[PDB]
Paper text:
Broadly neutralizing antibodies (bnAbs) to the HIV envelope (Env) V2-apex region are important leads for HIV vaccine design. Most V2-apex bnAbs engage Env with an uncommonly long heavy-chain complementarity-determining region 3 (HCDR3), suggesting that the rarity of bnAb precursors poses a challenge for vaccine priming. HCDR3s for these bnAbs mediate binding by reaching through the conserved glycan shield to contact a positively charged, semi-conserved protein surface on strand C of the V2 loop (Andrabi et al., 2015, 2017; Gorman et al., 2016; Landais et al., 2017; Lee et al., 2017; McLellan et al., 2011; Pancera et al., 2010, 2013; Pejchal et al., 2010; Sok et al., 2014). We then engineered ApexGT Env trimers that bound inferred germlines for PCT64 and PG9 and had higher affinities for bnAbs, determined cryo-EM structures of ApexGT trimers complexed with inferred-germline and bnAb forms of PCT64 and PG9, and developed an mRNA-encoded cell-surface ApexGT trimer.
The third-generation trimer, ApexGT3, was a combination of ApexGT2A and ApexGT2. ApexGT3 showed improved PG9 iGL binding, with a KD of 104 nM. We also determined structures for PG9 iGL in complex with ApexGT3 and for mature PG9 in complex with a Q130N variant, ApexGT3.2MUT, that contained a glycosylation site at position 130. The GT mutation R169 forms h bonds with the HCDR3 on two different gp120 protomers and is also positioned well for co-planar cation-π interactions with Y100e on both PG9 and PG9 iGL. The sulfated tyrosine at position 100e on PG9 iGL interacts with R169 on gp120A, while the mature PG9, which includes a sulfated Y100g, can also engage the N167gp120A glycan. Specifically, the germline-encoded tyrosines at both 100p and 100r in PG9 iGL, but not in PG9, displace N160gp120A out of the HC/LC binding pocket and likely contribute to the poor binding affinity of the iGL for most native Env trimers. PG9 iGL, but not PG9, engages with the N160gp120C glycan, using both the HC and LC, indicating that a trimeric interface is necessary to engage iGL but not mature PG9. PCT64 LMCA and PG9 iGL show near-identical binding angles with their respective ApexGT trimers.
Numbering used by the authors:
A (entry chain F), F (entry chain B), G (entry chain D): 520 to 546, 572 to 663
B (entry chain E), E (entry chain A), H (entry chain C): 32 to 57, 66 to 141, 150 to 185, 185g, 185h, 186 to 309, 312 to 321, 321A, ...
C (entry chain H): 2 to 52, 52A, 53 to 82, 82A, 82B, 82C, 83 to 100, 100A, ...
D (entry chain L): 2 to 9, 11 to 27, 27A, 27B, 27C, 28 to 95, 95A, 96 to 107
């Protein structure tokens, strides 16, 4: 598969092509505006991963439980019977709250423990 | 034993998006110094089972593209000689070079005064103009006084004969973080959930051919004649028809033109029409009569598919107004042709080795776009020009009413400029890549 | 600044004769020219005028059909071709330049085609003349 | 064809004399193209006045002229021996030809 | 026991720093396409336990705003018709239409030889001019040989009547990595600490009002009249006074002017005042007398806190120079007014309806700022002009010393653009965010 | 609290908003220049943190005792009373020496120690 | 040392300047082009390092062997008798191969294993 | 024995690269108001055992310098008064002064119709011009019709008297991610390995001195004269000779010229030489005779090593072409000089004080950079000037082809602006830093 070749596939399969997608995220005035735009988007995402404790991690298991009502679905349904495009449509309403929960419950709290335990 | 949030980066997810695109190549007004060659190996996904709904007329790629074209035209025209100094009273008489009856009144010969290399000196001079380039300025003073058509509005500019207007195809390429979706549905209706989609980094090249009533040198439909409209019952909007077979058109300006050059000012060269030798004949375009009729029969059947059965269809001539809308228009070699369509849109349809010649007229002073901010003068072309091109589509409008499924009349449109490219870019959509996604599981 | 006539020979009645004005010291090619004649004891009679291209040639009625005016812009030479000369055509023939120049109007000099001067309508530069005689 | 002009004129030295010349509509009452020449015997004529009253460079200020109707007039003020020359009137005509008058002999005594 | 060097990232620390700012709007001169949509959420965050020193006149936000207005004017005027073809002499006389002795000879009836659309034709035309726009030649035979006052300098340019010069407010926004710290202390002048602060990403809009004496349409002081200066003991600096009582001023150009236009060149339109219908009147501004007296009394109460008590204070008008530094210069409706404010500054204060009418002059040829490398014209305005504004503050100077350091006197003047915008920008400070730092503690 | 909400708070208290400050660091021609500069500044800090082994961390600990000559206040006296603005001023002139020290004293030594794990 | 201080030295010796060489990787229209380009080069390298499992690591160690056909030398020659400029030329034609292996053989295997160590 | 892969970041690896460079500042054409501040303390780092191979003429730094200089000239020139209004017929007479023998025919007194501030007033003006600036229109008739030499081609434009042409040295700096490699070797002739190198972030400053046949004000060789060429047997190439000893040259224009000026239009002014105070003499340059002889002998000494022994070496004057390729051209005070070099390149050398005075010509209308798209009028300089400069090197042309391959003869050449800069840029190369690399080890 090439770039986005996994778009029509099972989420649990597509997870094995994540580096394919990551690889292709980076490459008279418009040309600079375009290059700057790509950089800005790349960095916004990297920063967010760097807040949740995912710097350098392709996949992260977080320490944050979540509200089941966001998706009343079986894990087998999510991972085996549907695509990522479909998944995004189902949970698009919770993007901001998820990110906020991770921010507070991941490194903002975990690193309080890092200092407290450094004895 | 509850569920936890898991973050996945590199997720293959799209969002509708509008961004800028890069110009890519395979002097010249479009194939410029700030456009780069493409990689000729598109990394397609070979139609994986992804369905995506998208459409024409809402694709803002067209608007960006339109603006770039306007900018390229101005950029190449800025460092060119102003013809402002030539806005003087002109003295015209009848041209005497064996003009036939069909051409009487088409050409006018004016003498005038103009500046030259030295500021204080002015030299009498003459040039030949097409009648459409001048106006009469005063019956009262006499009957010989004329001026160039646009001297009472924005200045006319011309130089840079070395610059080509050849419609070299340009590819558009996505910026990093973006991708272009491509529709392979050859039966696509222009608005629906295209089941056959791929992804490219760059579109194929599109030739920036600018025309009015008939679309020339575009993509050909591959399987069948197809029709595109934003709303079929909207009689204010245009209808795009893509043909699946090209119509070959042979155009000419069959007159041997001498090109002359004088200086107006300090390196300010002016080119103009000198004597035309041999006799004078009308410019014209020919189409196979048989192929045109075959083409229409296919178009009519396709139109009927979007109407009830045994709909009686008529073709007819345009409403008039500016010549740009009235006639077919195209550029060839830098020359500008305005051609009648009387031999193309005339016949009617019923429920059950020859050619068509279209007379053409020539203009040199042209307001290129719908705006009147500037004006351009075409240079003359030395010798005799002949052009061959392919009709790949038609732009038609419906009359504002028809009656009881009969006399449904279609006429040449071409009122918008944008549909010259909507007809080529309909296969593409632009999306942003959103690699960061979240999906739950059971983990530590 | 000179006009020098030559060709003032003697011919029998009915014969032709060619005069030539060797103009020098001016842009001959930018000025109009005239031929004038004067029989001994007689006043001045105009014969002919010519434009730069020759596009304009006028003759006295008295010389019409017998006299042709022509010129060479490069050789700086004016010509007069006489045909069927009559006893009455004996005269001193003179080369004269049409004055004129640019027209100073509305702040800018105006010139004719190929920068030729326009006419001020009076002769200025005169030659010396040569004698053309018809014998008997 | 020719312009009407006196065969001769005369006056004493130092006096002002005029030489008249008469044309038609197609000269003086049709254009300002009206000129006068002075011809010393044995020589080509030279311009004295053009444009009715114009002074060529090199011509003395005692020479002048005027027009009225179809009559042209050359003024020679302060007659000298050097003025004993023929005078000619001429005009650029409608018909784009040059018409000369008969020629006037001036005697100064 | 021993503390180790540790690193904290995401630290709330500020640095005094200078960068540029983004333009956000609320076409016009300022609200051009090159400006960001209005901030939908000016999310101000108050800071507990923060005191900072904000010295204004060190605030380079002023300089950035100064440069932006200059550039915007130039961008707007750049494509306009020039008045170079009008730099000819004129034959002028006194125009008559029931003009009083006060305005007698002020307005001229002038004619000139104009260029028409075709350059080889000239016509005689008439227009009206104000005395301040034109100059004579004395020695060259006669006096009716007028010329425009600025044909001896950079070409006078002005047209584009469609462009609005209404001072629409513009917001400034910090670039990423920066924040704008705002002073909430209503008593704050321009120096020293501000005990109550908050930050924003974007400021509120500030109107780019141009003025020389009376600051118009600006922020109002809320608790008291505030007198601000870089230096309150010398006579070198200007005194900026912000009122807490808006003073209404009603200005007029009571002349029902008719506008005429011509074409000089290729779409090169020019506009001028033609006739005036009805009789001619003197331009003026009306200030409520009682309000003005109260205004000055409040200023005096505040002067006594920088100055001593029991001091006689007197006001006087500008010492002179061009009108720009002598009169109250302002624009309204595109018209340029030069109002005599001596009627506002002809009173004294001691140790312990009725309007004021200020006569005004009208000028059409202006130089915008203080640069003389450019000149602009002003369009005529059709009809009668009526304008209503609020005096927000004064630009005052102090006279250069007094006997026994008593009887202080003040005068309007010092109308630099930079000092007008100080009254709006003093509330803001721009700082850089430095998220990284070290704070040692116990760890391994 | 929002952005800079903790600016007047003590250093200890303010450690609770590190993620807030981080998120607000990221978003004619001069505006393009401003965007490019914001990126350049951001990347310099990220590079320095990477050099120190702080990529993805809100809080780091090194192998370096600090030199008391830089400040003679004790641990709780600083952390429970000073704000970060005050602290930064107090030790402002030692910023560069501390950073240089961290760059080599931690990682040249650590990378060698971790190389020797191959023997 | 300063920038390129050990450039002519051996590969082994040069390991002490890695912390030095990285320092100057980071800082109208030409200047933007130069700055944007420098950023892009920096970020491309960071992306590769992230994918390879180099989260700010100066020295990374992978789970991937190299092909015996690429070099017939022992470690003592590589580290003591060779410089980095020489080495780069010596293995120049395998860079792309190596990188493909570093990305794919490292991440697919790591996540297939890591996701199961989390149960 | 089973060893694995490690990745190293911060690896000291170089690649050849093509990128651009910055500027240096500490007005004029190059060190402008929009130029990058220089580095007060660049750090040169010696590289232990690095040998680097590089080539002159493959160095793209030269091309970057070329393009920037052209751009800077155009930026400087753009906001200047055009001299198109002065392209009128000139009525020329002689100079009423004491003219020396070599100056007869060198100057002409030109009178003309000129515009004034107002477009209805015209006056007669006069100016003195150098013969090379003036062309005969009609030798036949008039014997007085003349025009400026470039009025029939692109307009002559030049004013901006405030801008100097001082060749202020510019240091070039690399962007982050790049480094500049400097060669310290003193024998290398530019094609091969350099055993002693160091790197820098910025080069020393390089002066953009205009030159042809002789190279002025360049960095001097330190140990020996070095003769560098792309191919020694290719006589179509220029030969660069870098001296290890300066030769002093003193030039003068011994004429106390007075500058007069006129106002052409709306802030449009022109400056020209009017009166000349004192006698009129030819401009000239002095070269120490003894120094030149010894210096040239040193060049020959080296030619004998590059070429074979017992070959007679000769010097001769160039063969022809326009002034720009036959004289030694240089800028001094903003003025342009074209000096004869016949007294320099006149010698025979075999294997077995005083001075050289060179007469000079003056050209005011200049077609710089061999560009035909524009011309400039150097402004006159008030008073008498002197120039003192150092000869650092020569550009020689070998006359290829000889019977029996003997007696090599050289002529001055250098008709390429790019070849001047070679003398300072030859020491530098631009490198991309590649911090990533891979190597084998024992870890897992
Ligand atoms: C109001 O103005 C006064 C007078 O200028 C300010 O007092 C000065 O404050 C600065 C500190 O920025 C001191 O260095 C000066 O010595 C003070 N001047 C005098 C005469 O004492 C005062 O700070 C201003 N601000 C406020 C809020 O009142
Ligand atoms: C060039 O010619 C001008 C005239 O066009 C000379 O200027 C005149 O100089 C004489 C004295 O020699 C004065 O009496 C005239 O009044 C001047 N006329 C004007 C209009 O200024 C000028 O000196 C000549 N220059 C040279 C060097 O020949
Ligand atoms: C003023 O208006 C009156 C008519 O009301 C008219 O008679 C008079 O002449 C006018 N005066 C002037 C100076 O225009
Ligand atoms: C014009 O007005 C002036 C007063 O400014 C006066 O002196 C002059 O006589 C008036 N001229 C005419 C013609 O009314
Ligand atoms: C050259 O290489 C040797 C390798 O043994 C090294 O010791 C020395 O430092 C290097 N020296 C210089 C000055 O180049
Ligand atoms: C000089 O150039 C030649 C190539 O023509 C090269 O072989 C030689 O090594 C160079 N010599 C030096 C010392 O640079």
């Amino acid at each position: 598969l090439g770039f986005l070749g996994a778009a029509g596939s099972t989420m649990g399969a597509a997870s094995m092509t994540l580096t394919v997608q990551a690889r292709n995220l980076l490459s008279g005035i418009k040309q600079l505006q375009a290059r700057v735009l790509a950089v800005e988007h790349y960095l916004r995402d990297q920063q967010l991963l760097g807040i949740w404790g995912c710097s350098g991690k392709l996949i992260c298991c977080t320490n944050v439980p979540w509200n089941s009502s966001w998706s009343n679905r079986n894990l087998s349904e999510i991972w085996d019977n549907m695509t990522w495009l479909q998944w995004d449509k189902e949970i698009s309403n919770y993007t901001q709250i998820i990110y906020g929960l991770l921010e507070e419950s991941q490194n903002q709290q975990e690193k309080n423990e890092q200092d407290l335990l450094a004895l | 034993e509850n569920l936890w949030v898991t973050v996945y980066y590199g997720v293959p997810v799209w969002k509708d998006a509008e961004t800028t695109l890069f110009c890519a190549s395979d002097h010249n007004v479009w194939a410029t110094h700030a456009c780069v060659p493409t990689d000729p190996n598109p990394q397609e996904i070979h139609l994986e089972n992804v369905t995506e709904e998208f459409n024409m007329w809402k694709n803002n790629m067209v608007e960006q593209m339109h603006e770039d074209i306007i900018s390229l035209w101005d950029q190449s025209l800025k460092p060119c000689v102003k013809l402002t100094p030539l806005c003087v009273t002109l003295q015209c008489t009848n041209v005497t070079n064996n003009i036939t009856d069909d051409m009487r009144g088409e050409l006018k010969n004016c003498s005038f005064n103009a500046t030259t290399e030295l500021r204080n000196k002015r030299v009498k001079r003459y040039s030949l103009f097409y009648r459409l380039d001048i106006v009469q300025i005063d019956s009262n003073r006499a009957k010989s006084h004329y001026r160039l058509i646009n001297c009472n509005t924005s200045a006319i500019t011309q130089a840079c004969p070395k610059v080509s207007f050849e419609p070299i195809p340009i590819h558009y390429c996505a910026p990093a973080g973006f991708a272009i979706l491509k529709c392979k549905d050859k039966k696509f209706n222009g608005t629906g959930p295209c089941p056959s989609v791929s992804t490219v980094q760059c579109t194929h090249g599109i030739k920036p051919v600018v025309s009015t009533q008939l679309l020339l040198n575009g993509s050909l439909a591959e399987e069948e004649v197809i029709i595109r409209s934003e709303n079929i019952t909207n009689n204010a909007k245009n209808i795009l028809v893509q043909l699946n077979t090209p119509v070959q058109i042979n155009c000419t300006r069959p007159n041997n033109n001498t090109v002359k050059s004088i200086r107006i000012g300090p390196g300010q060269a002016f080119y103009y029409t000198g004597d035309i030798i041999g006799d004078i004949r009308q410019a014209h375009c020919n189409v196979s009569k048989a192929t045109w009729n075959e083409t229409l029969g296919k178009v009519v059947k396709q139109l009927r598919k979007h109407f009830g059965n045994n709909t009686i269809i008529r073709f007819a001539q345009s409403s008039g107004g500016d010549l740009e809308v009235t006639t077919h228009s195209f550029n060839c070699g830098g020359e500008f042709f305005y051609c009648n369509t009387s031999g193309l849109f005339n016949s009617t349809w019923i429920s059950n080795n020859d050619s068509i010649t279209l007379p053409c007229r020539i203009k040199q002073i042209i307001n290129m776009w719908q705006r009147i901010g500037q004006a351009m003068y075409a240079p003359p072309i030395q010798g005799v020009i002949r052009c061959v091109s392919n009709i790949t589509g038609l732009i038609l409008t419906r009359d504002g009413g028809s009656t009881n499924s009969t006399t449904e009349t279609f006429r040449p449109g071409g009122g918008d400029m944008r549909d010259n490219w909507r007809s080529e870019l309909y296969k593409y959509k632009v999306v942003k890549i959103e690699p960061l996604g979240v999906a739950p599981t059971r983990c530590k | 600044v000179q006009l020098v006539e030559s060709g003032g020979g003697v011919v029998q009645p009915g014969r032709s004769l060619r005069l030539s004005c060797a103009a020098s010291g001016f842009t001959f090619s930018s000025y109009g020219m005239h031929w004038v004649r004067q029989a001994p004891g007689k006043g001045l009679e105009w014969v002919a005028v010519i434009s730069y291209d020759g596009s304009n040639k006028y003759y006295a009625d008295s010389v019409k059909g017998r006299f042709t005016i022509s010129r060479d812009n490069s050789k700086n030479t004016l010509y007069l071709q006489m045909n069927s000369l009559r006893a009455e055509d004996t005269a001193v023939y003179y080369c004269a330049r049409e004055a004129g120049g640019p027209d100073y109007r509305n702040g800018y000099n105006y010139y004719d085609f190929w920068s030729g001067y326009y006419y001020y309508y009076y002769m200025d530069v005169w030659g010396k003349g040569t004698t053309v005689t018809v014998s008997s | 064809s020719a312009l009407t002009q006196p065969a001769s004129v005369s006056g004493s030295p130092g006096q002002s004399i005029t030489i008249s010349c008469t044309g038609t509509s197609s000269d003086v009452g049709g254009y300002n193209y009206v000129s006068w020449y002075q011809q010393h015997p044995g020589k080509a004529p030279k311009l004295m006045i053009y444009e009715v009253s114009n002074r060529p460079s090199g011509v003395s200020n005692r020479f002048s002229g005027s027009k009225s109707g179809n009559t042209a007039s050359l003024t020679i003020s302060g007659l000298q021996a050097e003025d004993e020359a023929d005078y000619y009137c001429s005009s650029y005509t409608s018909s784009s030809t040059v018409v000369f008058g008969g020629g006037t002999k001036l005697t100064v005594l």
